C-alpha cells in the first residue's frame, strides 16, 4: 500500500500515519517539504518569464513582417499558440497552487487546468508532426504536380486541433480522467492509476500508440526521407559549396529536432509504459513530476529551436525589438 | 516607532504586538507572507539561471577565441567576474535564506554575503566607468602620442578592484556596517539607519558623492565627448553611408548604456538620498527591497548590453555553443 485513493484523485503517499489529505482540500507538505513547493513555483516562474516573451514575440513579429506570413509558417504560429495555452492554462495556475501546497481550485478546476494544459502540449506535439509531413512533402515531392499552399496549411493546423481534442476531450467525459499529478499541484491525464470505471488501460494504450508511436514514426520517416533527398542532391552538386553547407545545416537541424522531440515526450511515454508493464509499482510525487518537467519546459526550447534558429524570424525579431533597425 | 532595533540589525516592522524576532534567529513571516518569500526565491532563481550562463559563457568563449582577447576587452571580462561574485555571493545565498524566511547564517554570514555581493556590484559599477574612460581616451584621443595597450587595461582592472574595496571593506571594520536589508534575507550596506557608533551619515555621503556622482559625471563627460567626436567626424564624411550608420549605432548604444546605468543605481542612490534628506521616515521591507532588485538584475542586463549586442562576442558564442560552426 503505497498511495491513498480518493473519489477524484490519487496521493502517492501512504496514509498509514493518518496525515494524508485531499489534494483539493489541504497542503501536501507530507509528500514534499515546503521549499520544494517553492522550487516548483520557481520553475513555473522561469517558464513564464521565458515562455511568454518567446512565444508572444513570435506571434507579434509575424503581425509586423510580411515575409514571415507564408503558408509553411502557419504551423509554427500554431506551435506558439499551443505554447501559450500551456503558459496560461498550466504554468500560471501551477505557480499559484504550488504556493498554496495543493490544488486549490477543486475538481472542476482540475478539469479545466488539465484540459487546457493537455490541449496545449498536444497541439504543440502534432504541430511538430504536421511540419515534418509538410517539409517532406515540399522537399521530397512525393506527389506529382503538387504545390503546397494556403489551403493545405489550414488543413494542417486544423488536423492539429482535431488530434489534440481526440486526446484532451475523452477524459472530460468518461474515457480516462483528470487528476492531480506528482506533487498534487497540477492536473494531468490519469495514465498510472488502474481505475477501471473510466477505462484507463485502454486510454493509455490509445495514447501510447496513436499519440506517441504514430507521431514518432511519421517524424522519422518524413525527416529520414528529407535528409536522404538533400544528401542525394548534394552528392550531385559537389561543386557548389553553398549546396554542401545547406546539406550539413539541414542534417544538424533534423538531428536537433528529432532528439528534442524525444527529450520532450519520451519520459511521459517511457514512464507510462513501465507502469503499464510493471503492474504494481510505487513511484513518489517528485519522480512523477519529472515527465511534466520535460514536456512543459519545451514551451521554451521548441520556439528556440523551430523559431529562433531560423534566419528570417531572428532578423525581424531584432528589428521589432530595436524599435527601428540595428 | 516604525521599526525594531537590535544590536546587529534593523527590522522594518513595529514590535508593539511582540511578534518581531531577530532576522538571524527566526522566520520573518510577519513582515511578508510566505509566498512572497517564495517569489523572492523565484527571482533569485531566475537571476541564477540566466546570470550564470550569460556571464560564464563570456569568460569561456574568451578562452576559446583569440580575437576577443584584446586589451579593450579586459574590463568586460572584469564585468563578468563581478557579475559572478554577485551570483554566488548574493543570489545563491539569498535563494537559500529566503526559503528559511530569515538570514540563517547569522551575523558573520551577514558580513560575508554582504561583502561579496557589495564587492561584486561595485566592481561591476566601476568597470562600467573605466570602460567609458578607455573608450573616450581611444576615440577622442585627448592625449598626444598615446596608444591604449595591455598595461593600461591592467591598471583599469586594478583601479576597479581598489574603488570597490574602498566601498565594501570599511563596513567590515567600523565605518558603516552590514545588516540584513528589506525582507531580512540578504545583507547590504547600512545606508538608512541613523546608527552613529559606526558613522553611517558620513559613509552614505561618501558613497553618494564618490561612488555615484563621480561615476555618473565621468560617464556623461566621457560618452558626451565620444558622441560629439563621432558626430563631428560624420558631418565631415556625409558621402560614406557606413560612417553615417556607425554614427547612429554608436549614439543609440550610448543612450542605452547611460539609461541602463541609471536604471541600475538610481534607485539605490535615490532612496539613500530621500532617507538622508527626510530624517524620520518609515519604509517597509518590500519597498526597501526594490533597490536590490534593480542592481542585482543587472548581472543579467549588463552582459546582454555590453557583451551580447557586440557583433564579435556574439559570433564566437554561437560557434562555441554549436560545437563547430553554424
Ligand atoms: C487519512 O487518514 C485519516 C485517518 O484515517 C483520515 O482522516 C480522518 O477522516 C475522518 C472522516 O473520514 C475524520 O473523522 C471525523 O472526525 C471528527 C472529529 O472532530 C468527527 O466528529 C467526524 O464526524 C463523525 O461522527 C459524527 C457522530 O455524531 C457523525 O455525525 C459524522 O457523520 C461522522 O461519523 C468524523 O468522524 C477523522 O477526524 C480524520 N482523522 C484525522 C487524523 O485527520 C483521512 O481522511 C485519510 N485521508 C484520505 C485522503 O482519505
Ligand atoms: C519583540 O517583542 C517581544 C516582547 O517584548 C520580545 O520577546 C521577548 O523577549 C524576552 C527576552 O528579552 C523574552 O523573555 C524571556 O521569557 C522566558 C519565558 O519562557 C523567560 O523564562 C526568560 O528568562 C528570564 O527570566 C529568568 C528568571 O529566572 C532569568 O534567569 C532570565 O535571565 C530572564 O530574565 C525571558 O524573560 C520573552 O518571552 C519574549 N516575548 C515573546 C512574546 O516572545 C522580542 O525580543 C522583541 N523583539 C526584538 C527583535 O527585540
Ligand atoms: C508498495 O511498496 C513496495 C515498494 O516500497 C512494493 O514492493 C516492491 O515490489 C515487489 C513486490 O511486488 C518486490 O519484489 C520489491 O522488493 C519491492 N521493492 C522494494 C524497493 O522494497 C509494492 O509492490 C508497492 N505496492 C503498491 C500497490 O504500490
Ligand atoms: C513612523 O510612523 C509614521 C508613518 O506611518 C510616521 O509619521 C509620518 O511622518 C510625519 C511625522 O513625522 C507626518 O507628517 C505624516 O503625516 C506621517 N505619515 C503618515 C502616512 O501617517 C513617523 O514619522 C514614523 N517614524 C519613524 C521614527 O519611523
Ligand atoms: C503540464 C503538463 C502537460 C501539458 C502534460 C501533457 C502530457 C501529455 C499530453 C501526455 C501524453 C502521453 C501519455 C499520457 C502517455 C503516453 C505517451 C504520451 C506522450 C502521448
Ligand atoms: C545584492 C545587493 C547588492 C550587491 C547591492 C549593492 C549596493 C550598493 C553598492 C549601493 C551603493 C550606493 C549606496 C549605498 C547609496 C548611494 C548610492 C550608491 C549607489 C553608490
Ligand atoms: C503570484 C501570487 C500567488 C499568491 C499565493 C498566496 C497563497 C496563500 O497561501 C496560504 O494558503 C494557506 C492554505 O491554503 C493558508 O493557511 C494561508 O493563510 C495562506 O496565506
Ligand atoms: C530522422 C532521423 C534522421 C537522422 C539524420 C541522418 C544522419 C546521417 O548523418 C550523416 O551520416 C553520414 C554517413 O553516411 C556522415 O558522412 C555525415 O557526417 C552525417 O551527418
Ligand atoms: C535550494 C535548496 C534550499 C533548501 C531550503 C530548506 C529550508 C529548510 O526550511 C525550514 O526551516 C525552518 C526554520 O528555519 C524549519 O522550521 C523547517 O523545519 C525547515 O524545513
Ligand atoms: C552621455 C549623454 C550623451 C547623449 C547622447 C547624445 C544625444 C544626441 O542625440 C542626437 O541629437 C541630434 C540633434 O542634434 C539628432 O539629429 C539625432 O537623431 C540624435 O541621435
Ligand atoms: C529600441 O530601439 C529599444 C532597444 C533596446 C533593447 C536593449 C536592452 C536589453 C535589455 C535586456 C534585459 C533582460 C533582463 C531580464 C531579467 C528580468
Ligand atoms: C552543438 O552543435 C550543439 C548545439 C545545439 C543547441 C540547440 C538547442 C537549444 C536549446 C535551448 C534550451 C533552453 C531551455 C531553458 C529552460 C531551462
UniProtKB/Swiss-Prot annotation, chains A, B:
GO biological process per UniProt: absorption of visible light; cellular response to light stimulus; detection of temperature stimulus involved in thermoception; G protein-coupled opsin signaling pathway; G protein-coupled receptor signaling pathway; gene expression; microtubule cytoskeleton organization; photoreceptor cell maintenance
- Give the transmembrane region(s): 37-61, 74-96, 111-133, 153-173, 203-224, 253-274, 287-308
Topology, Cytoplasmic side: 62-73, 134-152, 225-252
Q: Does the keyword Membrane apply?
A: yes
Q: Where are the annotated glycans?
A: 2, 15
Q: Name one GO molecular function term.
A: guanyl-nucleotide exchange factor activity
Q: Cite the positions of S-palmitoyl cysteine lipidation.
A: 322-323
Q: Which residues lie on this side of the membrane: Extracellular?
A: 1-36, 97-110, 174-202, 275-286
Q: Where is this motif: 'Ionic lock' involved in activated form stabilization?
A: 134-136
What is the first-listed, main subcellular location in coarse terms? membrane
Q: Which CDD domains match?
A: 7tmA_MWS_opsin
What Pfam families does the entry give? 7tm_1, Rhodopsin_N
Q: Which UniProt keywords apply?
A: Acetylation, Cell projection, Chromophore, Disulfide bond, G-protein coupled receptor, Glycoprotein, Lipoprotein, Membrane, Metal-binding, Palmitate, Phosphoprotein, Photoreceptor protein, Receptor, Retinal protein, Sensory transduction, Transducer, Transmembrane, Transmembrane helix, Vision, Zinc
Keyword Kinase tagged = no
Tissue expression per record? Expressed in rod-shaped photoreceptor cells in the retina that mediate vision in dim light (at protein level).
Q: How is it modified after translation?
A: Phosphorylated on some or all of the serine and threonine residues present in the C-terminal region. Contains one covalently linked retinal chromophore. Upon light absorption, the covalently bound 11-cis-retinal is converted to all-trans-retinal. After hydrolysis of the Schiff base and release of the covalently bound all-trans-retinal, active rhodopsin is regenerated by binding of a fresh molecule of 11-cis-retinal.
The terms describing its cellular component in GO are: cell-cell junction; G protein-coupled receptor complex; Golgi membrane; membrane; outer membrane; photoreceptor disc membrane; photoreceptor inner segment membrane; photoreceptor outer segment
- Location of this chain's protein in the cell: Membrane; Cell projection, Cilium, Photoreceptor outer segment
Q: Which purpose does this protein serve, as stated in its record?
A: Photoreceptor required for image-forming vision at low light intensity. Required for photoreceptor cell viability after birth. Light-induced isomerization of 11-cis to all-trans retinal triggers a conformational change that activates signaling via G-proteins. Subsequent receptor phosphorylation mediates displacement of the bound G-protein alpha subunit by the arrestin SAG and terminates signaling.
Q: How does it assemble?
A: Homodimer. May form a complex composed of RHO, GRK1 and RCVRN in a Ca(2+)-dependent manner; RCVRN prevents the interaction between GRK1 and RHO. Interacts with GRK1. Interacts (phosphorylated form) with SAG. Interacts with GNAT1. Interacts with GNAT3. SAG and G-proteins compete for a common binding site. Interacts with PRCD; the interaction promotes PRCD stability. Forms a complex with ASAP1 and ARF4. Forms a complex with ASAP1, RAB11A, Rabin8/RAB3IP, ARF4 and RAB11FIP3; the complex regulates Golgi-to-cilia rhodopsin/RHO transport in photoreceptors.
Q: Which family does it belong to?
A: Belongs to the G-protein coupled receptor 1 family. Opsin subfamily.
The family database entries (PANTHER family) matched by this protein are listed as: OPSIN
Report the protein name in the record.
Rhodopsin
Organism of origin is: Bos taurus
The encoding gene: RHO
